[PDB]
Design a binder for this molecule. Structure first.
Ligand code: ATP
Length: 337
């Protein structure tokens, strides 16, 4: 609402609204509709088949403010629009239509053909977002009206399964809205108002919005199973690929502290190909879903090794040792984060 509307859109919005409404009245007459004073559906009767001045002007103003909000959301979403040239709006070629596809009156509704206009992929994403906004507005209207979501459509209880996010909406209706809005956008583009979408900016959630402030959970064996001598082996299978650390930890490891950030833990972060002990150093490669990590510790000569599906991981140097020398201390236990 706070957006201010440029004068050229201001004196072109009426013609845009009438032309797009005429596109829908051409769509319904192609789908097989017939004009009727009463707003029937089974008998194919509705006043919204005739041109913009011959149907109820209250519906005309409804669709006019619909066009206004469409273009005004186009501006609100940062899609600045200019004109290619004023003569491209002065002269518009008209398609040829059969009479049955034509309306009742002689005001030829159909604009220059859809084939002439090309839609940039950025513009396609722009129409995708604009239809998202339109569906959100429509749903919010019925939310104020009292409608709520239901698994099955109900009229007396005011329950509609369509009151769902657009990403979960039904494909047929969402694509119908998509194509209608795409026809409208193609019309504005053909009018010489070549709209360029704002530069596509990438946003990363980075696993920040985890449920509850807990960012990780550490799983370890019991302290009594700590090994102080000998060489041992255990496996870690990664169902998913992401922020995972596996290795060996001392019985003093703190659950709230990340593995390898301090001395108690020796871990291998394969998300970043990153080894962790009192800091992070580059070691090995990254895994994928289903990869199995084999962890080796030899408490006699104080070395640790890792494998990824069998092949031994190597650091920046050709050394096979993830960690070269560490005190035995109180022992080590298997651990994962
Ligand atoms: N000016 C118009 N011209 C043509 N069709 C219109 C117009 N205004 C509304 N409609 C139709 O009426 C619908 C309005 O939805 P409404 O809230 O009345 O029904 P609903 O019970 O929520 O529908 P659904 O089961 O599709 O969710 C629009 O989706 C569209 O199909």
């Amino acid at each position: 609402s706070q957006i201010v509307l440029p004068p050229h859109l201001e004196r072109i919005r009426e013609k845009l609204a009438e032309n797009i409404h005429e596109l829908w009245v051409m769509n319904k007459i192609e789908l097989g509709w017939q004009y009727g004073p009463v707003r029937d559906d089974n008998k194919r009767q509705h006043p919204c088949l005739v041109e913009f001045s011959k149907l109820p002007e209250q519906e005309r103003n409804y669709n006019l403010q619909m066009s206004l909000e469409t273009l005004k959301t186009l501006l609100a979403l940062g899609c600045h629009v200019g004109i290619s040239d004023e003569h491209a709006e002065d002269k518009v070629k008209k398609m040829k239509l059969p009479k049955n596809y034509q309306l009742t009156s002689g005001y030829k509704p159909a604009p220059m053909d859809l084939s002439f206009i090309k839609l940039t992929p950025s513009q396609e994403a722009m129409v995708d977002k604009l239809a998202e906004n339109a569906h959100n507005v429509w749903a919010r209207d019925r939310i104020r009206q009292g409608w709520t979501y239901g698994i099955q459509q109900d009229v007396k209880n005011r329950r509609n399964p369509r009151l769902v996010p657009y990403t979960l909406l039904d494909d047929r209706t969402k694509k119908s809205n998509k194509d209608s809005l795409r026809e409208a956008v193609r019309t504005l583009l053909g009018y010489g108002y070549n709209l360029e979408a704002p530069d596509q900016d990438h946003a990363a959630r980075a696993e920040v919005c985890s449920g509850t402030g807990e960012r990780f959970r550490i799983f370890r064996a019991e302290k009594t199973y700590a090994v102080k001598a000998g060489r041992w082996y255990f496996e870690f299978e990664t169902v998913t690929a992401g922020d995972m650390r596996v290795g060996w930890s001392r019985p003093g490891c703190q659950p709230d502290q990340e593995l390898g950030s301090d001395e108690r833990a020796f871990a291998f972060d394969g998300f970043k190909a990153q080894r962790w002990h009192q800091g992070n150093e580059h070691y090995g490669r990254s895994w994928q879903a289903g990869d199995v990590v084999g962890c080796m510790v030899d408490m006699n000569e104080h070395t640790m090794m890792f494998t990824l599906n069998g092949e031994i991981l190597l650091d920046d140097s050709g050394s096979e040792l993830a960690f070269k020398d560490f005190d035995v201390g109180d022992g080590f236990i298997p651990v994962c984060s």
